[PDB]
Write an enzyme that holds these catalytic residues in place. Sequence first.
Site, mmCIF file in Angstrom:
data_model
loop_
_atom_site.group_PDB
_atom_site.id
_atom_site.type_symbol
_atom_site.label_atom_id
_atom_site.label_comp_id
_atom_site.label_asym_id
_atom_site.label_seq_id
_atom_site.Cartn_x
_atom_site.Cartn_y
_atom_site.Cartn_z
ATOM 1 C CG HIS A 1 -2.087 -1.157 1.186
ATOM 2 N ND1 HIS A 1 -3.266 -0.911 0.719
ATOM 3 C CD2 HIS A 1 -1.988 -2.277 1.495
ATOM 4 C CE1 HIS A 1 -4.115 -1.913 0.603
ATOM 5 N NE2 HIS A 1 -3.272 -2.797 1.482
ATOM 6 C CB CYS B 1 -3.918 2.293 -2.565
ATOM 7 S SG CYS B 1 -2.953 2.117 -0.924
HETATM 8 ZN ZN LIG Z 1 -3.972 0.781 0.716
#
Ligand SMILES: [Zn+2]
Lengths: 285, 1084
Positions: free
Chosen positions: B654, B699
């Site tokens: 992430h 992300c």
């Molecule tokens: Zn994330």
Amino acid sequence: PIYDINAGDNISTSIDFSYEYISGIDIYINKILIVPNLYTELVNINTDYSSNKYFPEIIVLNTDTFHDKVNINLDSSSLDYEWAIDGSDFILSRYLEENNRKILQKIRIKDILSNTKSFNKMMIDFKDIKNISLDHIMNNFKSFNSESELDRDHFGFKTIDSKTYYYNEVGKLVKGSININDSLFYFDTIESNLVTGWKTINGKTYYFDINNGVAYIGYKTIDGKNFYFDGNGIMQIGVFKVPDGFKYFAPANTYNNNEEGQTIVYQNKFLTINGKKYYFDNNSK
Amino acid sequence: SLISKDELIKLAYSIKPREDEYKTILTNLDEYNKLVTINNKDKYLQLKKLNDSIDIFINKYKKSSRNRALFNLKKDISKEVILIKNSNISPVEKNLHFVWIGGEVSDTALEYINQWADINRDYNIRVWYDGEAFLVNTLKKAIVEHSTTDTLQLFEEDIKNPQFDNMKFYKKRMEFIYERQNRFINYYKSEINKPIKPTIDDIIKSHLVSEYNKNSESLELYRRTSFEKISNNNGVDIRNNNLFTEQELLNIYNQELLDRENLAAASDLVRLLALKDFGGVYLDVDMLPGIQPDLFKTISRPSSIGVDSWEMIKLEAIMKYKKYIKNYTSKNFDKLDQQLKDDFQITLESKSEKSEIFSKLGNLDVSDLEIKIAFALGSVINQALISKKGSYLTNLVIEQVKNRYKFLNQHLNPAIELGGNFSDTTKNFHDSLFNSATSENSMFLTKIASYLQVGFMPEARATISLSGPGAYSSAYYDFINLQDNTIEKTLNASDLMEFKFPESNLSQFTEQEINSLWSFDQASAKYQFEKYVRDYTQESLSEDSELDFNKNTVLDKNYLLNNKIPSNNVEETGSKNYVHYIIQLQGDDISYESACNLFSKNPKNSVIIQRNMNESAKSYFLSDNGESISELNKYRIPQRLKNKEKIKVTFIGHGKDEFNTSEFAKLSVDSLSNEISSFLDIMKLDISPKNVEINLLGCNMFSYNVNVEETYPGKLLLNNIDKIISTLPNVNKDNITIGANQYEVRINNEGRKELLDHSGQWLNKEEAIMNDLSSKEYIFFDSIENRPKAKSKNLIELASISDNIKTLLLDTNIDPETKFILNNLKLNIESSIDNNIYYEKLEPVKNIIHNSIDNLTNEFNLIENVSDELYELKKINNLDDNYLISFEDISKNDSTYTIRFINKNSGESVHIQTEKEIFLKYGEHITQEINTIKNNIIIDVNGNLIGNIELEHAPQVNTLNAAFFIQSLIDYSNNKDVLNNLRTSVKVQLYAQLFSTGLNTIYDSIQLVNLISNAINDAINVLPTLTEGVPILATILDGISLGAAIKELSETNDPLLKKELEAKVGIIAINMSLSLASMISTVI
Ligand SMILES: [Zn+2]
């Protein structure tokens, strides 16, 4: 195009190619390389296939000219074509199925994607549609992917995942029997993969070794049956000398359903072969 | 110059009489050849007239025989233009222009300006401003603020849902902004029409105080302070200096300033008109003077830093140690090693005068036809401009701007006049637009379709095509190719290199300039919307606020094997020649699920490593029978994959929620570089690939295509390229690519794509999938220019996406908001395709046939270069067409070369000296070629060659190239082959070396004349055949061809020929003649 410098007001603006004038020798050709000049405005490509058997990939080179549009005129149905790109080249591919024969023809327009002028300059004419731009083709036709290990550049044996291929010094696959390193290999005539096993060509029989792919010559043993192949690997029938004497290599079903070209048991009987006589003792020598 | 009249008359010969147009061409050509004037404009207009006449004739008689010559004439005219441009250069006027409109000028801009003023004190600084438009930017900001608040209020229930597609927010906001813009426009139209005219600022003030509740006294104070500041800093008023003399340009300026509040386009017009009216140099407010070339010539750039970061570091060091500018950051400088920092400080503190560090402009020489423009990323940019007063190219650029704005307005105004809302205006505009598409303006129309959204919605880019660099590239094409009003044509880079602003005078990589350079992409859109929502509800939100980064779920082999593998519908097409490592870095649930799905896409070639379990990490891969999940030690692979050619490795994690993220899976760049090094030192034991492709998946990991070296993938590549190339010996720098993605995509059983969302379940968000797929960029290291470059996009994937979008738009179950969104996405994808073709980003294939053809073209370049040089040389020394140049007799004297010319009538030899090295370089080249044709020839007999035959592919290819090259020279019929003669020089040299000892040793003029006559009358054939010319019969004895000699000897009836053939070869016929039999019978 044929260039007659001072011909007058008749200079030809056309290049007419047909897949039928290279019939016979199309197994000896690498690629077909069309080269327009200043005057070339139309490129006639007569497709067809009832004549040829292998069709080489066409490459249409892009030169400077004073014409705004250059037509490529194909005489086939637009329904069979697909497009792809490779770097700056635009590839059209035609696939048909006729009489259990797969017909695959490729036309590569070279460096047409390099800039806006070259991109807009070429037009294409199919049989049922006329004046199809390259942008229209990109928008309305199906697409395929143009990359595979069989399209790379090698120069010897390649082993692509189950099957061996051989490339000439110019990087083209080899089809049909051929001699490398003083040995007779036979590469299949459609897939171009190395063939092993028994092979009957035009009524004469060969055996290609399963270990290396080389054709057997001399006196050989195959699954407990003894055969004899001449200097070129063609299986021979007759009375021949082997390391243990003179033995009979007999036709099909001469004795106990023996295969064609295998030694048989021949005891105490005369033999006549195209006028020559022999006699075989108790031991079939 | 051009060839003269009569040489063309000889070249353009045809059997038919001279048509009228051919007479006109001859008249214009002769008129040009005699034009003696120093005003280059008249020469250029004469070239234009000649070119127009040539085009008329060529179009009328497409089949004629003369066109060949005429066509080359056109080519030459183009080159001729450059010669006109590069003469009569004179220093530009001593003016320096800057532009700041619509608000108070910031202090940082003023510091950048003073840096120019201080070292260039002989230049007149001017800061152009609009004295009646100081409140425009405040109006724009008020519009945006109120519309933003209204839209956040309307979606107040939805905005806390993380599933929010912010494109809905932006479309709603744009509808509000369009409403308010129409309101102000109607107010202004009602106010300005009064008998007493108020100024624009008064109208803006009244409207602001009436509608958005601004304090009038504050606005008046703001206007006053802005005015006095810019007046005290060399301010020059636009309206006081009478710039807009044409009503059309003033209409364009008003439409951009007031109706759209687009200060950038207003500045574009104003910069052009200022250069046109005054001449000088235009500069942005964040360009700094060039640093002296030799200041840091002694410090070597480390391998770990690219060139642009190096220039930025140099400026930072200067501004830190001398403190010319306030608040200049040092963020990049501090990361350097200590030695480099001390070298910087040492080299600096010895330097006292500002003139020792920054370079003065001085006298910039430019012609009265040319305008020079800065270069960035290989393409033109209007950061800095040089032009004389009243340049020709400036008026060309202004005509281009006016034309593009007229085609826009012609479609936009009727669509606005209906008085509809934003959506109806959009639809009517688009239809009126795409009703007029042809083959010449398809790309232009596609680009300017998003005119209404510039600056409010992400990815609107009409400004580049309307007044930006598009107009400049079109103007340059119109200039060199002597046309007018071309749209979306381009010059090749070799010609654009002519108009480059001298780089030594401009330091483009300043800090304000990199911040200006970031575009309003999708990344900034997402991270700005998040800021809006945080500041509106006073909350904290995070996509993965509450996820566990410790769960450390171990791989469930049966979950992978019985559920993930058989349910996958996504088979990759193409070459299966890679091995795909899957290195999961974080232990949350989403990382685990994404790793498992990514493995399921190709189970046979992929391996999983669960790194988060640091010490217990093992490599799980599908066993050879395909029925079980085998395991090996960390980073090790089974035998069946060791023969692959390419590696692809995927890190999963992430990314930290910030613009231009700096941490991925809580690791900075250097931590992940250590991870890569640890991976490599173990991996190199099993496989030695030829390519490495790294991915970062997670992300907030975006792919930026501008400011590559500033982003996470650019830094990663720059830091790890040396390790990767040093550990794996077969890998080139151009074979290592780095990419970044955000979403994990699968295909369900229904045929639709779904992405594993951060909440644990797969939704089917088609707009987000399409956008994220089409936005991905792969970055590699360009070794020619030595910097990171984004690799050209995959056009097949883009076409598939566009087709999917069209099919979705056919499905009527989609609601109208998503229809608008999908239509905008389609426009953006078409623009991306057209950009990939237009900017020439598609790289050639580079295999054997392509090398061959390219070498042929490279050879055809040299010939024309040498032909032009020979025309020049023979014309200067007044040597006529009867002299043939001998390329064997070039002698070097320390700066010059002496070349011997041979008269074809008398044999007298002349010696001419020249400075051009090319004549030597080419002259030896041909000398080698005739040294291979002559190296497979065996002694000739009856004035005819009997050659050798070689059947190996090593010497056959060179001989074929030598024969093709010489044959092309001997059949080359160029223009400018009449004052010189190259078809004859080469032919005579060939004949001399084949049938004699060579021209270099022959000086007797009678021998020369006889040999020249023999060569010219005799035709020679060099390209390899077996029976020269016709087909007869091949009798190749041991490496010797004897078909022609044998067929000559079996009919000759000549005793001399028989004697030659017997003496030099060894052939002996039988002579089965009856006459001789009878004669011998009588003799006995
Ligand atoms: Zn994330």
